[PDB]
A paper describes a structure:
In addition, we determined the crystal structure of A/Denver/57 HA in complex with the anti-influenza antibody C05 fragment antigen binding (Fab). Although we were unable to solve the structure of the A/Denver/57/1957 trimer in isolation, we solved a 2.92 Å resolution structure of this HA bound to the head-binding antibody C05 Fab. Our structure showed a similar mode of antibody binding to that determined previously for C05 bound to HA from IV A/Hong Kong/1/196820. PISA analysis of the HA:C05 complex revealed that seven HA residues mediate the interaction between the HA RBD antigenic motif and the C05 heavy chain, while only two HA residues mediate binding to the C05 light chain. Interestingly, our structure of the H1N1 influenza strain A/Denver/57 HA bound to the bnAb C05 Fab indicates that both the heavy and light chains contribute to binding. Further, the surface area buried by the C05 heavy chain CDR is ~ 786 Å2, which is close to that of the 2D1 antibody. Comparing the structure of A/Denver/57 HA in complex with C05 Fab to our six other HA structures showed differences in the C05 antibody binding site. The only residue conserved in all seven structures is Tyr108, which is also one of the conserved sialic acid binding pocket sites. The antibody C05 Fab failed to bind many of our other IVA HAs, as examined by analytical size exclusion chromatography. Failure to bind correlated with an insertion in HA between 146R-G147 of the epitope, whereas sequences without an insertion bound the antibody.
Numbering used by the authors:
A (entry chain A): 19 to 123
B (entry chain B), D (entry chain B), E (entry chain B): 346 to 502
C (entry chain A): 289 to 339
The structure:
């Protein structure tokens, strides 16, 4: 005889269709970035400004718990930490705070 | 069509070389052959299709975050509304695009084998019993010199 | 870390070749659009039937 | 294909039981039969398709309204722009999705009957005149014991 | 299907009147004929399809611009985010819609000629050698009075 057929594999890959769910398939590719690398990386060739135990308020005012800037710097974004509480040690209101943060990013 | 998983039931595991082809029992090699055109035109088309779902989305530099003070709740909510809006649109349009174009891809293989099967039945005519399984009993069981020429689709009478 | 990316997210950086990501909605950079999805797998081949 | 409203012209009103099947004139029951597989696989697929256009849209809690004072017209307009934007996107994407997937649904029935017709013609072979209407004149007008077995697709020579 | 650029290889330049039809060599006119129904139903359907990609987008009056002072950078960026968002959505959805519905349009012609070819082969039966090119060698080379009646699909035995 002579037949005409197609390929089959030992692949476990399952996909969904509009007419039937969980169809097992020979070859597939992912469209969904599900994983991240867990590290702060450089953006546009620049490293972020890392404020540490300080926030922008504390850093730009010279809160004594903030590390002072040594050289001229560039940065592509600003990184704060969940425990960056050191801002205005003498209490009061910081005018247009959010605006300044956005403009310094 | 009804070629894939219709009258050609299941599939073959023995084709390490391609996606479509033939299985011949005559007087020699019982192996399988790939159709380097029926297949290398599909991969030329599928990789073209994935690469355009991937790369047709150009996206600019964007910092999504916005920070608002306690007397700016309205802005905060307007901003959240915009983020929820896009999320809802891209989530719905992506999930369905994947769903629909997957069926469009599985049909592509139906239309391909059905045309490859019709590339030999509309060529061999009444020189074989047209078994419904997707297979043809040969009247002069071609040797390996002839069978390798039906791949190119070339016969005589 | 000493890495470069096109897209940084609050838990880390992400490869931005895929058009959709579900890590976090509030990103910075040239990023995949955020979706609430969990699986978006697209077919390149046929259905396995080796019974 | 050209099965539906092509060479099978109009349709039958007498099938209270299903969507696809047969009509036999032989020596007994002049009724119609349903193909409980050709049909129960379509409903398994269509209800699957509606339920995913419905349920693939998850949507969060959202209060769309925003209120602005007479010195906040810009915000008011930015907000209105966002609402008009979504309206335009969902209105256009929905109207077209309905339009396109309706044609994809009507084709589904063409591809189904054309395969059911080809499920018996590619099985009965030259034991009937293949009338273009979508109907076959039987050489040994099968009784009700045989005709009910062509439904399963089972013959002899 | 495999009709267009499959077994009917290339196409004909000689049809100033329509999109689909026939070429007959018998004993008289060597010209081409248009199928004023196979064609005037396609144009009724395509112009319907373009006119709905065009006109299903209703859009309101909108002034996209917004102006912000130097202490309103956040709003400025929120606004830019909204504009980039729509741009990304409409650019991606349009590019792909054009891409996909173009293939849906080229298939439409495959399914049309394949049904027109099957409108005469499923009608003439064994009164011609069914050449794989998409052409039929006539047993009683019909004159211009008969050939113009196969267009309507009308024969005898
Ligand atoms: C930089 O940031 C650190 C924190 O990351 C910050 O240290 C914190 O200082 C505050 C205020 O000096 C501390 O809070 C006090 O803790 C003592 C106990 O040790 C309490 O008695 C204090 O009572 C006050 O608050 C009470 C209500 O909570 C009132 O009832 C009472 O009357 C007082 O007002 C107060 O809670 C806090 O413990 C530390 N945290 C740490 C981790 O050390 C530091 O001051 C910042 N420095 C600068 C320059 O910004
Ligand atoms: C601190 O300031 C000095 C200058 O005041 C910075 O030096 C600059 O370093 C960058 C690094 O690449 C140089 O950029 C390059 O410039 C050329 C043109 O000269 C451009 O074609 C390249 O594409 C690239 O951008 C820049 O020229 C240089 N400037 C000077 C005046 O030498 C230094 O980078 C600053 N430090 C930090 C940490 O940012």
């Amino acid at each position: 005889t002579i037949c005409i057929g197609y390929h089959a594999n030992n692949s476990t890959d399952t996909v969904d269709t509009v007419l039937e769910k969980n169809v097992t398939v020979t070859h597939s590719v992912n469209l969904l970035e599900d994983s991240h690398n867990g590290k702060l990386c450089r953006l546009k060739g620049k490293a972020p400004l890392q404020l540490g135990n300080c926030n922008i308020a504390g850093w730009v005012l010279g809160n004594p718990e903030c590390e002072s800037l040594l050289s001229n710097r560039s940065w592509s974004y600003i990184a704060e930490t969940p425990n960056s509480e050191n801002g205005t040690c003498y209490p009061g209101d910081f005018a247009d705070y959010e605006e300044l943060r956005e403009q310094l990013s | 069509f009804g070629a894939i998983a219709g009258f050609i039931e299941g599939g073959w595991t023995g084709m390490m070389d391609g996606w479509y082809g033939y299985h011949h029992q005559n007087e020699q090699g019982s192996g399988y052959a790939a159709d380097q055109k029926s297949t290398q035109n599909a991969i030329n088309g599928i990789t073209n299709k994935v690469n355009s779902v991937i790369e047709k989305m150009n996206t600019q530099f964007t910092a999504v975050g916005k920070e608002f003070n306690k007397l700016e709740k309205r802005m905060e909510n307007l901003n959240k509304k915009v983020d929820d809006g896009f999320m809802d649109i891209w989530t719905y349009n992506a999930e369905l695009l994947v769903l629909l174009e997957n069926e469009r891809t599985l049909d592509f293989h139906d239309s391909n084998v059905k045309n490859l099967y019709e590339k030999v039945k509309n060529q061999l005519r009444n020189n074989a019993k047209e078994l419904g399984n997707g297979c043809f009993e040969f009247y002069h069981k071609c040797d390996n010199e002839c069978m390798e020429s039906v791949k190119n689709g070339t016969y005589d009478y | 870390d000493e890495c470069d990316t096109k897209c940084q997210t609050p838990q880390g950086a992400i490869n931005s070749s895929l058009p959709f990501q579900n890590i976090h909605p509030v990103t910075i950079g040239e990023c995949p659009k955020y979706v609430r999805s969990t699986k978006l797998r697209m077919v390149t081949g046929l259905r396995n039937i080796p019974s």
